[PDB]
Amino acid sequence: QPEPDMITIFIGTWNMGNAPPPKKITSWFLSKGQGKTRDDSADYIPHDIYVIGTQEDPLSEKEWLEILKHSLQEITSVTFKTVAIHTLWNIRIVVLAKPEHENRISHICTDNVKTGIANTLGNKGAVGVSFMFNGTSLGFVNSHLTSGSEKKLRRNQNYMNILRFLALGDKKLSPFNITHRFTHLFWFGDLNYRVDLPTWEAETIIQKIKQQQYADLLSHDQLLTERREQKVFLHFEEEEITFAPTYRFERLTRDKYAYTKQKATGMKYNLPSWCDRVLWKSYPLVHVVCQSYGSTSDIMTSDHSPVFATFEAGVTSQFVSKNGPGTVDSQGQIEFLRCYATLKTKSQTKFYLEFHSSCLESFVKSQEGENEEGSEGELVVKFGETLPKLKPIISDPEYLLDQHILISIKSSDSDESYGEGCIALRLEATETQLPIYTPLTHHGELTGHFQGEIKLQTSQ
Ligand SMILES: CC(=O)Nc1cccc2nonc12
Numbered sequence: 001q002p003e004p005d006m007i008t009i010f011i012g013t014w015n016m017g018n019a020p021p022p023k024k025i026t027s028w029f030l031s032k033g034q035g036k037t038r039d040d041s042a043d044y045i046p047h048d049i050y051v052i053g054t055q056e057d058p059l060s061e062k063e064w065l066e067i068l069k070h071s072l073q074e075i076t077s078v079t080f081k082t083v084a085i086h087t088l089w090n091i092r093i094v095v096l097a098k099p100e101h102e103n104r105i106s107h108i109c110t111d112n113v114k115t116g117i118a119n120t121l122g123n124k125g126a127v128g129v130s131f132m133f134n135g136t137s138l139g140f141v142n143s144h145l146t147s148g149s150e151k152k153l154r155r156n157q158n159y160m161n162i163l164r165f166l167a168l169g170d171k172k173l174s175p176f177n178i179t180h181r182f183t184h185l186f187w188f189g190d191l192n193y194r195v196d197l198p199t200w201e202a203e204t205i206i207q208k209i210k211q212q213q214y215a216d217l218l219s220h221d222q223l224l225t226e227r228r229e230q231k232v233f234l235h236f237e238e239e240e241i242t243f244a245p246t247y248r249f250e251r252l253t254r255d256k257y258a259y260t261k262q263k264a265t266g267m268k269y270n271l272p273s274w275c276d277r278v279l280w281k282s283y284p285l286v287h288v289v290c291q292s293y294g295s296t297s298d299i300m301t302s303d304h305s306p307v308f309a310t311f312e313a314g315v316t317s318q319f320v321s322k323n324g325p326g327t328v329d330s331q332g333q334i335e336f337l338r339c340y341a342t343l344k345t346k347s348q349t350k351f352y353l354e355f356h357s358s359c360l361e362s363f364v365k366s367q368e369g370e371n372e373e374g375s376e377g378e379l380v381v382k383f384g385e386t387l388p389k390l391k392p393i394i395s396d397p398e399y400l401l402d403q404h405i406l407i408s409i410k411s412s413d414s415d416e417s418y419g420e421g422c423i424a425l426r427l428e429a430t431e432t433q434l435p436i437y438t439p440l441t442h443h444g445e446l447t448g449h450f451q452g453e454i455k456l457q458t459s460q
Pocket residue numbers: 081082083084097101102103105106108
């Protein structure tokens with residue numbers, strides 16, 4: 001039975017509005033309703049992995065697992081295995097997998113982050129799951145961010161706290177936050193970004209939604225605008241939105257948006273908005289294709305509609321050679337040539353690099369680079385041809401070309417990372433000097449760039 005080189009992943013996000021679900025929620029897992037929907041011819045074909053995020057979830061873990069497993073069994077006739085379940089307050093993530101994947105999945109991690117202080121600490125935050133699927137690391141974040149049209153900056157702060165403090169994936173990757181630890185990272189939830197139009201325009205917005213004319217609404221979506229101004233979710237992707245706003249509905253129909261201020265809303269308007277989202281970030285030159293992104297039309301117990309997204313995701317096999325794992329393979333090498341980091345920092349410490357990759361036995365520290373002044377004020381750290389030659393565990397190009405090198409640039413004075421990035425070894429040529437580039441981030445904000453050349457030797 002061969003190991004897969006592609007899997008499909010279902011991501012669901014639903015704010016349940018503290019109400020039990022209806023008896024049938026199969027439309028969700030089938031990607032049926034509005035938006036980019038799944039072809040009917042696929043309905044019996046199970047996804048490899050189903051990741052369900054809920055918010056305002058009133059059920060016990062047991063209650064929801066029974067509904068989910070029985071739902072998938074009805075669709076697919078497959079009894080899914082529970083990989084992980086983790087709940088913070090009423091925020092929950094469930095990971096289910098086809099039974100054939102049970103002995104491909106390992107290194108399962110769960111964590112949560114509570115956002116805010118005092119007043120603002122007590123119901124918002126995130127849960128997450130990570131695991132290995134053969135040679136591929138997968139991370140999943142379900143976040144319920146701060147509500148309210150006038151709190152987009154709070155949401156952005158919530159995002160940064162979650163990606164700093166959620167402790168998933170390989171702890172040996174110590175300079176790296178979750179936005180660098182995974183081949184594929186999916187971040188979804190009730191992100192709570194709103195359509196930023198005047199309150200007086202509520203009926204106009206509703207009109208536009210009834211005509212399926214979303215362009216003038218999406219141009220005011222706070223998540224799209226904040227992302228475009230690099231305020232949040234830097235280097236993440238989102239499929240185009242082609243479904244109606246998923247909030248705020250009257251319960252038990254989808255015919256009415258309930259937007260007017262009420263005691264129950266703290267006298268806040270809830271103009272129709274795309275609160276409920278799925279974004280991802282994959283390592284450079286790894287296959288990831290969104291095959292659906294939409295909302296259900298027939299699940300009406302909540303003031304939110306469920307959102308689905310499905311993905312094709314490239315995976316790799318757990319590679320064994322006569323040499324690595326357990327030793328280096330002298331027919332392999334990675335050389336970084338004429339490299340320099342451009343940093344936004346005003347500080348004047350020396351810097352060194354760390355190279356982290358599961359193709360190395362352990363991480364590699366460089367010598368200190370040479371600081372020069374950039375023409376427009378910048379710090380440029382020059383490494384020249386001084387960088388250590390990296391010794392991969394496996395030289396076979398079918399393995400090595402599928403790998404990635406994480407780079408941290410660290411202060412000699414503090415050993416703190418000033419920037420993190422990632423370089424793909426999926427090169428156009430071996431034994432050939434080729435340009436490389438990554439942006440550098442720290443706490444998910446841009447701090448600089450790393451560029452230079454690479455020369456990769458494989459056994460072929
Ligand atoms: C510990 C647990 O609850 N579940 C699992 C552990 C390891 C692999 C699995 N594959 O499916 N479910 C899995």
